[PDB]
Amino acid sequence: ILSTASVLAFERKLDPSDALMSAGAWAQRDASQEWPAVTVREKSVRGTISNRLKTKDRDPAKLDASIQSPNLQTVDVANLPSDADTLKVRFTLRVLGGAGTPSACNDAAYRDKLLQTVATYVNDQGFAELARRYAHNLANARFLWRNRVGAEAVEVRINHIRQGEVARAWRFDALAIGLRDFKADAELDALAELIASGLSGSGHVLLEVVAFARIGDGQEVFPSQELILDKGDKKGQKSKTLYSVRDAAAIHSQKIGNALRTIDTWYPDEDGLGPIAVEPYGSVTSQGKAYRQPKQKLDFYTLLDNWVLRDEAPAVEQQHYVIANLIRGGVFGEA
Amino acid sequence: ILSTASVLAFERKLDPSDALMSAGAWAQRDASQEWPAVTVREKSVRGTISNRLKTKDRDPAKLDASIQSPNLQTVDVANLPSDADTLKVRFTLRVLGGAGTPSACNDAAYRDKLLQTVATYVNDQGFAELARRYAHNLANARFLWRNRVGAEAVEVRINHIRQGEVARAWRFDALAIGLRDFKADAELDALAELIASGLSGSGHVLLEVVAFARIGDGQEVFPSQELILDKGDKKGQKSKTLYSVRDAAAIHSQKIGNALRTIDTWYPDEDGLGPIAVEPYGSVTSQGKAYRQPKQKLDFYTLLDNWVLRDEAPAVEQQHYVIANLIRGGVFGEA
Amino acid sequence: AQICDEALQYAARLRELEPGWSATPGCQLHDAEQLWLDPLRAQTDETFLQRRLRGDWPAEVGNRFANWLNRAVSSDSQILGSPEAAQWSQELSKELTMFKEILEDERD
Amino acid sequence: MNAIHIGPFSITPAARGLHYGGLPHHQWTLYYGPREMAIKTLPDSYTSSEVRDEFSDIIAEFVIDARHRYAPDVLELVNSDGDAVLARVAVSRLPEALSGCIPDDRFPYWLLTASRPRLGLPVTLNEYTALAVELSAPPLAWITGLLPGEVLTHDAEEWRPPTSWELRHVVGEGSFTGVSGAAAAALLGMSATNFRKYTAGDSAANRQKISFAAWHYLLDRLGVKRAS
DNA sequence: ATAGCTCGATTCGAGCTAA
DNA sequence: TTAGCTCGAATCGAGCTAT
Q: What is the DSSP string of C33-75?
A: HHHHH-TTHHHH-TTTTHHHHHHH---HHHHHHHHHHHHTS--
Do A79 and B18 contact (CB within 8 A), yes or no? yes
How many residue pairs bridge chain A and chain B with CB atoms within 8 Å of each other?
Answer: 124
DSSP SS3 for D28: strand
- What are A210's strand-pairing partners? A90, A157
**3-state secondary structure labels for all residues of chain B:** CCCECCCEEECCCCEECCEEEEEECCCCHHHHHHCCECCEEEEEEEECCCCCCCCCCCCHHHHHHHHHCCEEEEEEEEECCCCCCEEEEEEEEEECCCCCCCCEECCHHHHHHHHHHHHHHHHHCCCCHHHHHHHHHHHCCCCCCCCCCCCCEEEEEEEEECCCCEEEEEEEECCCCCCCCCCCCHHHHHHHHHHHHHHCCCCCEEEEEEEEEECCCCCEECCCECCCCCCCCCCCCCCECECECCCCEEECHHHHHHHHCEEECCCCCCCCCCCEECCHHHEECCCCEECCCHHHCCCHHHHHHHHHCCCCCCCHHHHHHHHHHHHHCEEECCC
Residue from A51, A225, A293 whose CB has the most chain B CBs within 10 Å, to mutate: A51
3-state class (DSSP) for residue D221: helix
AA identity, residue C8? L
Q: Give the residue before each break in chain C, using a C-to-N cut-off of over 2.5 angstroms; say none if it is continuous.
A: none
Rounded to whole angstroms, the Cα distance separating D120 from B335 reads 10
The set of residues, in sequence order, having a beta carbon less than 8 Å from that of A186 and lying 6+ positions away, is none
Measure A243 CA to nearest chain C CA, in Å.
25
Q: B173 has which bridge partners?
A: B155
- The conformation of residue C22, written as its DSSP 8-state character, comes to G
Residue B103 burial class via C-beta count within 10 angstroms: exposed 0-12, middle 13-18, buried 19 and up = middle
Task: Identify whether residues B281 and B222 lie together within a single domain.
Answer: no
CA distance A17 to A327: 17
- Say if the Cβ atoms of A67 and B334 lie within 8 Å: no
- What does the alpha-carbon distance between residue B320 and residue B132 come to, in Å, rounded to a whole number? 12
Residue-wise burial string across A116-150, b where 16 or more C-beta atoms lie within 10 A, e elsewhere? ebbeebbeeeebbbbbbbbbbbbbbbbbbbebbbb
Residue D81 C-alpha, separation from nearest chain A C-alpha, in angstroms: 6
Q: Are residues B132 and B154 in the same domain?
A: yes
> A203 and A58, same structural domain?
yes
Q: Are strands A19-24 and A86-95 parallel, antiparallel or unpaired?
A: antiparallel
A285 and A326 in a single domain? The answer is: yes
Q: How many angstroms separate the CA atoms of B33 and A69, rounded?
A: 41
Q: Does B106 touch chain D (CB under 8 A)?
A: yes
Phi, psi of B258, deg, nearest 5 = -65, -40
Classified as helix, coil or strand, D48 is helix
* Integer Cα distance of D185 and B141 in angstroms: 86
* Domains in chain C: boundaries: 1-108
From A262, A286, A317, the end of a domain falls on A262
Residue B206 domain boundaries = 12-98+127-262
- Among the partner-chain residues B91, B108, B295, the one whose CB lies closest to the CB of A218 is B91
Which residues have a Cβ under 8 Å from the Cβ of B236 and sit 6 or more positions away? B72, B73, B74
- How far apart are alpha carbons A308 and A120 in whole angstroms? 11
Shared-domain flag, residues A93 and A232: yes
Whether B230 and B181 map to the same domain: the answer is: yes
A80 and A216 share a domain? yes
- Give me the number of domains chain B comprises: 2
Q: Residue A103 — φ and ψ, nearest 5°?
A: -85, -30
Q: What size, in residues, is chain D?
A: 228
Q: List the Cα angle B278/B279/B282 in 5-degree steps.
A: 90
Cβ partners under 8 Å of residue C8, min gap 6: C99, C102
Nearest nucleotide (C1') to alpha carbon of D206:
F5
Neighbouring subunits of D (3+ Cβ pairs under 8 A): A, B
Elucidation technique: cryo-EM
State whether the Cα torsion B121-B122-B127-B128 is positive or negative: negative
Sign of the torsion angle spanned by Cα atoms B189, B193, B199, B200: positive
Q: Give the orientation angle of helix A129-139 with respect to helix A316-328, to 10 degrees.
A: 60
Sign of the C-alpha dihedral computed for residues B77, B83, B86 and B91 taken in this order? negative
Three-state DSSP state, D118: coil
Q: What is the DSSP letter of D141?
A: G
Burial B7-24 (b: 16+ CB within 10 A, else e): bbebbbbbbbbbbbbbbb
CA of residue D164 relative to chain centroid, distance: 15
Q: Supply the angle between the helices A186-200 and A129-139 in degrees, to the nearest 10.
A: 120
Q: Which of A211, A232, A262 is the last residue of a domain?
A: A262
Neighbours of B192 (CB within 10 A): 24
What number of H helices and E strands is found in chain C?
7, 0
If residue D199 lies in a helix (H) or strand (E), which one and from where to where? none
CA dist A72 and A53 (Å) reads 20
Q: Is residue D67's beta carbon less than 7 angstroms from any atom in nucleic acid strand F?
A: no
Task: Tell me the C-alpha distance between A124 and B11, whole Å.
Answer: 45
CA D129 to chain CA mean position, Å: 26
Residues lying close to strand F (Cβ under 7 A), chosen from 85-144 of chain D, are: none
Residue D58 CB lies within 7 Å of the nucleic strand E: no
Q: How far apart are CA D100 and CA D79, in angstroms?
A: 17
Smallest Cα–Cα separation from B214: which of B79, B20, B25, B21?
A: B25
SS3 per residue for chain A: CCCCCCCEECCCCCEECCEEEEEECCCCHHHHHHCCECCEEEEEEEECCCCCCCCCCCCHHHHHHHHHCCEEEEEEEEECCCCCCEEEEEEEEEECCCCCCCCEECCHHHHHHHHHHHHHHHHHCCCCHHHHHHHHHHHCCCCCCCCCCCCCEEEEEEEEECCCCEEEEEEEECCCCCCCCCCCCHHHHHHHHHHHHHHHCCCCEEEEEEEEEECCCCCEECCCECCCCCCCCCCCCCCECECECCCCEEECHHHHHHHHCEEECCCCCCCCCCCEECCHHHEECCCCEECCCHHHCCCHHHHHHHHHCCCCCCCHHHHHHHHHHHHHCCEECCC
Residues B311, A107: Cα–Cα separation, whole Å: 59
Nearest Cα residue to B91 out of B28, B162, B144, B30: B144
Amino acid at position D149, single letter: G
Question: H or E element: which one contains D87?
Answer: strand D85-90
The answer to whether B42 and B242 have CB atoms below 8 angstroms apart is no
Hey, are the CB atoms on B231 and C55 less than 8 Å from each other? no
Overall resolution, Å: 2.8
Strand F at less than 7 A from CB of D7: no
Q: SS3 for D11?
A: strand
Instruction: Identify whether the C-beta of residue B2 lies closer than 8 Å to the C-beta of residue B331.
Output: no
Cβ partners under 8 Å of residue A300, min gap 6: A279, A280, A281, A292, A321, A322, A325
Q: Any idea what DSSP says for residue D172?
A: S
C56 to chain B nearest CA, in Å?
8
The whole-angstrom separation of Cα A176 and Cα A178 is 6
**Letter for the amino acid at D165?**
W
Q: How far is CA B124 from CA B130, B184, B307, B319, in A?
A: 14, 21, 14, 11
Strand partners, B169: B159
Q: After which residues is chain B broken (C to N over 2.5 A)?
A: none
Those residues whose C-beta lies under 8 Å from the C-beta of residue C52, and which sit 6 or more positions away, are B234, C35
Q: Which helix (H) or strand (E) holds C83?
A: none
Taking the C-alpha atoms of residue B311 and residue B113, their distance in angstroms, rounded to an integer, is 10
Q: Which amino acid is residue C83, in one-letter code?
A: P
Are A191 and A308 in the same domain?
Answer: no
Q: What residues of A are in contact with residue D100 (Cβ under 8 Å)?
A: 288
Rounded Cα gap, residues D217 and A122, in angstroms: 48
Give the span between the Cα atoms of B281 and B301, in whole angstroms: 8
Same domain for A209 and A271, yes or no, is no
Which residues are CB-contacts of A211 (< 8 A; sequence separation ≥ 6)?
A: A88, A89, A90, A141, A143, A144, A154, A155, A156, A157, A174
Give strand ranges (E) for D101-225: 110-113, 119-122
Q: State how far the Cα of C49 lies from the Cα of C19, in Å rounded to an integer.
A: 13
- DSSP class of D142: G
Strand order in the sheet with D74-78: D85-90, D74-78, D110-113, D119-122, D99-100
Kindly identify which residue of chain A lies nearest to residue B281, measuring between CA atoms: A50
The answer to whether C61 and C69 have CB atoms below 8 angstroms apart is no
Is B175 an 8 Å CB contact of chain A? no
Measured CA angle at A199 (ends A195, A200), to 5 deg: 115
Segment 154-173 of chain A within 8 Å of chain C by CB: none
CA–CA separation, B82 and B78 (whole Å): 12
Q: Give every CB contact of residue A329 below 8 A, 6+ residues apart in sequence.
A: A10, A11, A12, A13
The rounded distance, in Å, linking the Cα atoms of A307 and A314 is 7
| β-strands B276-277, B262-264 pairing | antiparallel
In the listed set A236, A262, A288, which residue is the last one of a domain according to the structure? A262
Give me the residues of D, 84-123, that contact A with CB < 8 A.
100, 102, 117
Burial class of residue D8 in the structure, from the number of CB atoms within 10 Å of its CB (0-12 exposed, 13-18 middle, 19+ buried)? buried
Distance of alpha carbon D63 from alpha carbon B95, whole angstroms: 58
Decide: D140 and D134 in contact? Cβ < 8 Å.
no
- Verify that B210 and B90 share a domain, yes or no: yes
Q: What whole-number distance in Å separates Cα of residue D218 and Cα of residue D208? A: 16
Establish how many alpha carbons lie within 13 A of residue B270's alpha carbon, considering only the half-sphere containing its beta carbon. Answer: 1
Distant-in-sequence, close-in-space partners of A285: CB < 8 Å, separation ≥ 6: none
Cα C12 off chain centre by: 12
Element (H, E) at D99: strand D99-100
Q: Are B266 and B253 in contact (CB under 8 A)?
A: no
Report the sign of the C-alpha dihedral through residues C41, C47, C52, C57, in that order: positive
B105 and chain D: CB distance < 8 Å anywhere? yes
Assess contact for B167 and B280: CB atoms under 8 A.
Answer: no
Residues 195-214 of D with CB under 7 A from strand E: 197-198, 206-211, 214
Max CA pair span of chain C:
52
Answer whether D121's CB lies under 8 Å from B1's CB: yes
Q: Which amino acid is at B314?
A: P
Q: How far is the CA of D193 from the C1' of F7 (A)?
A: 14
Rounded CA-CA distance A117/A99 in Å is 12
* Amino acid in the structure at residue A124: D
Contacts of D117 in chain A (CB under 8 A): 288
Q: Which residues pair with C80 in a beta bridge?
A: none
Q: Do A275 and A229 belong to one domain?
A: no
Q: How far apart are CA A53 and CA A60, in angstroms?
A: 12
Distance in angstroms: CA D210, C1' F9: 19
Same domain for A202 and A302, yes or no, is no
- C-alpha angle A317/A97/A188, rounded to 5°? 60
C-alpha–C-alpha distance, residues B258 and B271, integer Å: 18
